[PDB]
Structures are given as structure tokens and as C-alpha cells.
């Protein structure tokens, strides 16, 4: 079970909407599990100079 | 008290779209100077999970 999603623990494939948490942990998340819209997601992933952090890393 | 835009050296004021580099240095940049679009700008300021880094910090 290779890149486990941080929220749901199931594997993240390339043909799923996935984001890396560059804020710290370096875990991937299914976009769906994080609750983030396709509209936020596609834009984040189109701006290279933008980077994201998960709910847990932004909490500390 | 002056905030020079890390690209153009001119002050960043309140009536101007601006963005802080939290990857690293922590200078303010006018949105216009970065060549960042308004939609990316709205996402980045809206979403607290999304942080921005300038070309110099992202570069190295
Ligand atoms: Zn998931
Ligand atoms: Zn994280
Ligand atoms: Zn400027
Ligand atoms: Zn910077």
C-alpha cells in the first residue's frame, strides 16, 4: 500500500486528484479527502509558486 | 514605515494587491510585479493552507 493518503490511508494514484503537503509532513492527500474544490485544486496545481499544507501541519 | 516590494523596491500599501513570501525571506511583493494573475491571487489570499514563495526562494 505505496503512497497512502494522509486522511483515508488508501493509495493515491496519478489519475486521482492528489496534493502533497509541502508545508512539512510530505504526505499526499486525495483532493476529495481534504475537502478542497476542483477549482481550488486546479489552480493550486497550476501555480508552481503556490504550495499547500494539510490540516494537521497548519494546526501546529 | 516602508515595505519595499522585493521586486521593484517601491512601497507596498493597502490599496494594492500584495503577497508575502512565506517560503523564506519575508518580503512583500506587489501582485503586479510577480506577474501573478488575479485568480491565483484571490486563491492565495483567501486560502490559509496555500502559501506563496518568490522566484528567488522557490528557485533555490
Ligand atoms: Zn484519501
Ligand atoms: Zn501536512
Ligand atoms: Zn512591486
Ligand atoms: Zn522569497
UniProtKB/Swiss-Prot annotation, chains A, B:
Annotated segments matching region Interaction with BCL9: 35-53
Residue span of region Interaction with H3K4me2: 3-50
Cell location: Nucleus
ZnF locations on chain (PHD-type): 2-60
Protein task: Involved in signal transduction through the Wnt pathway.
Assembly: Interacts with BCL9 via The PHD-type zinc finger motiv, and thereby becomes part of the nuclear beta-catenin/TCF complex. Found in a complex with BCL9L, CDC73, CTNNB1 and PYGO1. Interacts with histone H3 mono-, di- or tri-methylated at 'Lys4' (H3K4me1, H3K4me2, H3K4me3); the interaction is enhanced by the interaction with BCL9.
Identification of the protein by name: Pygopus homolog 1
Amino acid at each position: 500500500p505505496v503512497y497512502p493518503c494522509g486522511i483515508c490511508t488508501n493509495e493515491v494514484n496519478d489519475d486521482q486528484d492528489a496534493i502533497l503537503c509541502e508545508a512539512s509532513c510530505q504526505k499526499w492527500f486525495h483532493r476529495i479527502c481534504t475537502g478542497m474544490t476542483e477549482t481550488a485544486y486546479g489552480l493550486l496545481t497550476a501555480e508552481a509558486s503556490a504550495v499547500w499544507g494539510c490540516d494537521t501541519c497548519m494546526a501546529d
